[PDB]
């Protein structure tokens, strides 16, 4: 009988709602980190209602059967595990108190089963990972291959330390190393570049360097970053290269590996980034988007006086014109609030105030007028009417009533969405997020909550037990898992790709095993799964006599002769290369200096002759109706201007000296010639109008965000840094500027300094939002905002601590949503273009297109004639033994074991292990050559007719020659670098693995197909990098060295400028590179320095051109990243379907 009451209370809306509210209260209580004493019995009531739900459903389902119908659906295994773990932890349990407390966190995953639909959407997540399988297999394969490369190339190189030369007390390296352990003792013997926890690396090559005077490079001690940044073992190499693939802080590994092993390993980092990192991130995106869209489409398919007043007002509101009137009022109010900054005269202040109150009075008048004109019920009927009502109420709450009070006027700007179709699309997607895929945003919120509380329960005790490992002040770091808020912040900062800097600290405090487990789970499930689903979703949603005439004729013939065109291409290349040599080392090599100064005149003359020939051959009409000819004509005119200036003399005067730096634009004449660059420029030119539309929408989005940020953080970043150490004063003394200045004239070395990228005005706010949205430089702004107190007050450590939610909201919307919106609209535009152009790709020339067609022609559906068996029967049995699948898989397993014996190597291995590994490698080589030579004895005339067979031949040849060359090196010569780079030949034997792994051979063929469009994009990116590097060498050479700019990385020569620019291409470290430029106006500088060896003066850069340079370069690099992203997506689609 009561089984009926059980089922009838089980199936019930309010029953499900009460369990929902109970588990949300559970999720509220699981974030206490130290629950009070009165909470044990309420936790008991939680357990009681959970077990009451459980016994209710078992009474409804089982009836002494063995819970068959209750456990046939796995979603109740969750409930059962929850209740049993709760009971065993209530009764006697073991000592792993935190590691068993954390198990009650599935009371948060119970929400997935309680709330409807979430079951289906987590089903979609688990269906997407099943397709992500093969991409993850290929990801770990390439990560391990590049980890072996980096191992063989930099094993121990990160141990290089500049050790002393004058050792006292007859000590030696070992005698002091086994003696010293405190970091001050380490500092007394190594270099330790003024602040870094790790000793500075040096190098034996002439370029890497540079151990100072009295120090000699030697590899002793621990690798940098507590010992976690290293290539010594295959494990640490795989971790550092996963760090590179997810581009997490890869800029520091770049700088360290170059400083230790040589500047010529920029090649290794270029290959690693522009193949592994980019191609793999975008391959994950391609496969996630494919699975998502396939499942998505498979899813889809005085009463008279009052009425006279009413008539009068409803007629005078004059619908078709008062709309535009209040629209321009809204736009002027936007741009009137936008002119508020921290340095403000009281005149500007009261002007802003009166303008704002006038505008809000106008708004209130109009809104109330039309409300009682068209019937408050009919008014409140409409969303925009109720929005304007809300806005006027929040405005009038500032009648006679802190900046969050006023900063809710900002969202007036959305009123423009009714007239703005691009803002309509933006409103559509922003509302869709809380509507149709509110399920996905809720699943993300639940996952982030669960990982926050899991990380807290695991590691927050250790963080407090002793930070003294990861801190010297023995206080909590910035990003610690000790509170729920900070655990959530860490999970957010790992959703953004910045896991490693916090994983190091967490590893040091609480064990590498648990920290790797937790952070790898967070990273994978967030980034490579869910935060990819959002972008794939936006992508899918946006998817859905008369001698003159013969003179002109012969001139046309000569000008369009291929010989003349190639001659001018060669001269363009020469005249552009002639710019690499003019760096700070040009006061030396005076012979080449003079040679280039005369070659520049020769080039000016040649290009003027070409311009005049093109004139005489085309006509002024055909010339000046061509953008390429217009650009060439402009550059030739600038060249002629500077030439006639330097020839007439009297020319080092201001404007013409500035015109001289525009010689950096000489490489632009190569766009017109190289059609690879020309087609990518045409694609970008076709895409630029939609870009401009969405860019205006996102600029006004960011303007809303930046006016909010300015109201929040205007002038609250000034702190008293103590110039020697770079440490903010303790805020117990000197709590404000008036005490900072007393300190500054009682002592000599304190500087009340700003942050130089802040929210002091809307321009700097746009810059700070750019940094926060790029995630490269955001942390200094976040720290200063959360420390902010007031305008002229010394910050206090996390005094606000909740402007972190301002930054979280700004990321989630302005950065996340708008950059994914950029991507969506740009892919939609590129697909519109690909369809307009007859269905052809839009990044390849036509020669490249037919190359790529004949390339994809290898995607044969036909199995080729295997080979004709020989008549000689012993060779025939050899033949079948060779061809059998057992033989194939045996060779595969031998290759895997070769990979394993390459992995097992490490730094500081003993001589016995080294020699036994040598002998295992040589026997591997012998058996590999044996199998290849016997299959050749079988297929003498038919073996080399296959690409994989010729690759096998090539790799066995290169491996045998590398090992015999190591033998000959031993016997004859001495070259460690060449030794290692020749040992690198044996990696082909492992690269043979993709012969049989089809799920990764397919994606390798996809990358090979994408290679031509990638080459055109790389041509254009290299020309943009050349132009920017020449601009760098001209302007930003001689800047002060800080952050990103040092001896190894700066714009002083072409090598240094191109390595800095390749670092920036991935947006990595662009804030650090821009920070030494942004400072002028001493004491940020010395504007009249000497710089021995050159006539240049002053060691800072113009902030205007610095900001322009770096912002424009990161935006152009973003657009070409989108270009390569589209190439990857298109070719993955192609290889999958065909």
């Amino acid at each position: 009988p009561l089984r009926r009451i059980s089922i009838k209370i089980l199936v019930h809306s309010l029953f499900s709602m009460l369990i929902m509210c109970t588990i949300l209260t559970n999720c509220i209580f699981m974030t206490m980190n130290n629950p009070p004493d009165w909470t044990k019995n309420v936790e008991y009531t939680f357990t009681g209602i959970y077990t009451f739900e459980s016994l209710v459903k078992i009474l409804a389902r089982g009836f002494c059967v063995g819970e068959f119908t209750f456990l046939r659906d796995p979603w109740n295994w969750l409930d059962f595990v929850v209740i049993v773990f709760a009971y065993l932890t209530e009764f006697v349990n073991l000592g792993n108190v935190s590691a068993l407390r954390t198990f009650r966190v599935l009371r948060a995953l119970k929400t997935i089963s309680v709330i409807p639909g979430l079951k289906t959407i987590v089903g979609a997540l688990i269906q997407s990972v099943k397709k992500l399988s093969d991409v993850m297999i290929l990801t770990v394969f390439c990560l391990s291959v590049f980890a072996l490369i980096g191992l063989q190339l930099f094993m121990g190189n990160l141990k290089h330390k500049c050790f002393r030369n004058s050792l006292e007390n007859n000590e030696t390296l070992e005698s002091i190393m086994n003696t010293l352990e405190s970091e001050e003792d380490f500092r007394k013997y190594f270099y330790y570049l003024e602040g870094s926890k790790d000793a500075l690396l040096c190098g034996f090559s002439t370029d890497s360097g540079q151990c100072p005077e009295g120090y000699t490079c030697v590899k002793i001690g621990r690798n940098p970053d507590y010992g976690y940044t290293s290539f010594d073992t295959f494990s640490w190499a795989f971790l550092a290269l996963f760090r590179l693939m997810t581009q997490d802080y890869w800029e520091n590994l770049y700088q360290q590996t170059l400083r230790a092993a040589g500047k010529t390993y920029m090649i290794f980092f270029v290959v690693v980034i522009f193949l592994g990192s980019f191609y793999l991130i975008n391959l994950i995106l391609a496969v996630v988007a494919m699975a998502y869209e396939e499942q998505n489409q498979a899813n889809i398919e005085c009463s008279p006086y009052w009425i006279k007043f009413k008539k009068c007002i409803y007629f005078i509101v004059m619908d078709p014109f008062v709309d535009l009137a209040i629209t321009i009022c809204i736009v002027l109010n936007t741009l009137f609030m936008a002119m508020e900054h921290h340095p403000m005269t009281e005149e500007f202040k009261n002007v802003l105030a009166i303008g704002n109150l006038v505008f809000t009075g106008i708004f209130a008048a109009e809104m109330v007028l039309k409300l009682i004109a068209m019937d408050p019920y009919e008014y409140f009927q409409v969303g925009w009417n109720i929005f304007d009502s809300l806005i006027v109420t929040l405005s009038l709450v500032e009648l006679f009533l802190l900046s969050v009070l006023r900063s809710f006027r900002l969202l007036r700007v959305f009123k423009l969405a009714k007239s703005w179709p691009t803002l309509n699309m933006l409103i559509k997607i922003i509302g869709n997020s809380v509507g149709a895929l509110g399920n996905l945003t809720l699943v993300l919120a639940i996952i982030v909550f669960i990982f926050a509380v899991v990380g807290m329960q695991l590691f927050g005790k250790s963080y407090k037990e002793c930070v003294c490992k990861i801190n010297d002040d023995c206080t909590l770091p910035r990003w610690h898992m000790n509170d729920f808020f900070h655990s959530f912040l860490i999970v957010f900062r790992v959703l953004c790709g910045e896991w490693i800097e916090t994983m190091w600290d967490c590893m040091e405090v609480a064990g590498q095993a648990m920290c790797l487990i937790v952070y790898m789970m967070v990273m994978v499930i967030g980034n490579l799964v869910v935060l990819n689903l959002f972008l794939a979703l936006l992508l899918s949603s946006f998817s859905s006599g008369k001698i003159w005439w013969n003179i002109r004729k012969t001139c046309y013939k000569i000008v369009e002769h291929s010989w003349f065109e190639s001659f001018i291409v060669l001269m363009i290349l020469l005249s552009s290369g002639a710019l690499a040599f003019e760096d700070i080392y040009i006061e030396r090599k005076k012979t080449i200096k003079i040679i280039l100064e005369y070659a520049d005149k020769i080039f000016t003359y040649i290009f003027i002759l070409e311009m005049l020939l093109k004139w005489i051959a085309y006509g002024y009409k055909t010339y000046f109706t061509n953008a390429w000819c217009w650009l060439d004509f402009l550059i030739v005119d600038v060249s002629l201007v500077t030439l006639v200036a330097n020839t007439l003399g009297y020319s080092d005067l201001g404007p013409i000296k500035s015109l001289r730096t525009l010689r950096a634009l000489r490489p632009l004449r190569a766009l017109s010639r190289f059609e690879g660059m020309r087609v990518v420029v045409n694609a970008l030119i076709g895409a630029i109008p939609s870009i401009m539309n969405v860019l205006l929408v996102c600029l006004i989005f960011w303007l809303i965000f930046s006016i909010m940020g300015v109201n929040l953080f205007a002038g609250k970043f000034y702190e008293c840094i103590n110039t020697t150490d770079g440490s903010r004063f303790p805020a117990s003394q000197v709590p404000n500027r008036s005490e900072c200045f007393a300190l500054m004239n009682v002592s000599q070395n304190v500087r009340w300094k700003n942050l130089k990228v802040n929210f002091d005005n809307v321009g700097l706010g746009y810059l700070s939002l750019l940094q926060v949205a790029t995630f490269k430089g955001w942390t200094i702004i976040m720290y200063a905002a959360v420390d902010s107190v007031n305008v002229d007050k010394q910050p206090k450590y996390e005094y606000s601590l909740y402007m972190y939610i301002y930054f979280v909201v700004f990321i989630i919307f302005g950065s996340f949503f708008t950059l994914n919106l950029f991507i969506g609209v740009i892919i939609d535009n590129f697909n519109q273009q690909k369809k307009k152009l007859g269905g052809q790709d839009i990044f390849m020339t036509e020669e490249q297109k037919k190359y790529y067609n004949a390339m994809k022609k290898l995607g044969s559906k036909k199995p080729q004639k295997p080979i004709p068996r020989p008549g000689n029967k012993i060779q025939g049995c050899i033949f079948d033994l060779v061809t059998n699948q057992a033989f194939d898989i045996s060779i595969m397993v031998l290759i895997c074991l070769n990979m394993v014996t390459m992995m097992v190597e490490k730094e500081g291995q003993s001589q016995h292990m080294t020699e036994v590994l040598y002998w295992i490698n040589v026997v591997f080589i012998i058996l590999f050559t044996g199998e290849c030579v016997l299959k050749l004895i079988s297929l003498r005339h038919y073996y080399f007719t296959v690409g994989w067979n010729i690759f096998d031949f090539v790799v066995v040849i290169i491996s045998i020659v590398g090992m015999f060359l190591a033998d000959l090196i031993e016997t004859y010569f001495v070259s460690p670098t060449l030794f290692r780079v020749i040992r690198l030949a044996r990696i082909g034997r492992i690269l043979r693995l993709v012969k049989g792994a089809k799920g990764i051979r397919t994606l390798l063929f996809a990358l090979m197909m994408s290679l031509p469009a990638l080459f055109n994009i790389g041509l254009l990116l290299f020309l943009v990098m050349f132009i920017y590097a020449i601009f760098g060498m001209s302007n930003f050479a001689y800047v002060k060295k800080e952050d990103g700019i040092n001896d190894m990385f700066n714009f002083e020569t072409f090598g240094n400028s191109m390595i800095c620019l390749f670092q920036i291409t991935t947006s990595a470290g662009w804030d650090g590179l821009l920070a030494p430029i942004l400072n002028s106006k001493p004491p940020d500088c010395d504007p009249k320095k000497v710089h021995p060896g050159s006539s240049v003066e002053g060691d800072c850069g113009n902030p205007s051109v610095g900001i322009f340079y770096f912002v424009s370069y990161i935006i152009i690099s973003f657009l070409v990243v989108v270009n390569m992203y589209i190439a990857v997506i298109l070719e993955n689609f192609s290889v999958a379907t065909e």
Binding site: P212, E213, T554, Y598, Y605, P1092
Partner: protein
């Protein structure tokens, strides 16, 4: 940053000349401490006579009358980390012809470590009466003009060639 550039090895009589000796550090952040000493031998002499030593910021000159009153410091100012030891000669004479030697006694500074290095720059200058423009510059200018001439000659050659060819093709109809 700093850059070591070689001095100019050809003075001219009755004029002024700045002898370059730039010796920068391997790491510019280091807080070194440097002074300098100059030794000089005339042409056809077996000696190396000290002429002028620049210590922390005082430049005191030796008893040599071959340089007395016609030489002044032309290096780093008020730094105490000199890194640029360049000497200026006013009213160059015929006796300013020989091998100079630039001593750089750089005593660095570290945590509890004070290195003591020394680099020696030797500069040989030969005074003349008229400034001879260097053969590299003269051949570069001659080659510039030669290349301009041969390029325009190639241009006009192909011009008239194609022109009379297409004229023969024009009067074919």
């Amino acid at each position: 940053g700093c850059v070591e550039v070689d001095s100019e090895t050809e003075a001219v009589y009755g004029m002024t000349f700045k002898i370059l000796c730039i010796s920068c550090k391997r790491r510019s952040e280091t807080n070194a401490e440097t002074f300098t000493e100059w030794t000089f031998r005339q042409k056809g002499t077996e000696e190396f006579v000290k002429i002028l030593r620049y210590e922390n910021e005082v430049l005191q000159l030796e008893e040599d009358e071959r340089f007395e009153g016609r030489v002044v410091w032309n290096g780093s100012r008020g730094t105490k980390d000199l890194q640029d030891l360049s000497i200026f000669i006013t009213n160059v004479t015929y006796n300013h012809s020989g091998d100079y030697e630039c001593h750089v006694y750089r005593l660095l500074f570290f945590e509890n470590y004070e290195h003591n290095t020394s680099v020696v720059k030797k500069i040989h200058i030969e005074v003349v009466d008229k400034a001879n423009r260097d053969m590299a510059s003269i051949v570069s200018e001659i080659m510039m003009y030669v290349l301009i001439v041969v390029l325009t000659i190639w241009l006009v050659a192909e011009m008239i060639y194609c022109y009379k060819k297409i004229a023969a093709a024009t009067e074919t109809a």
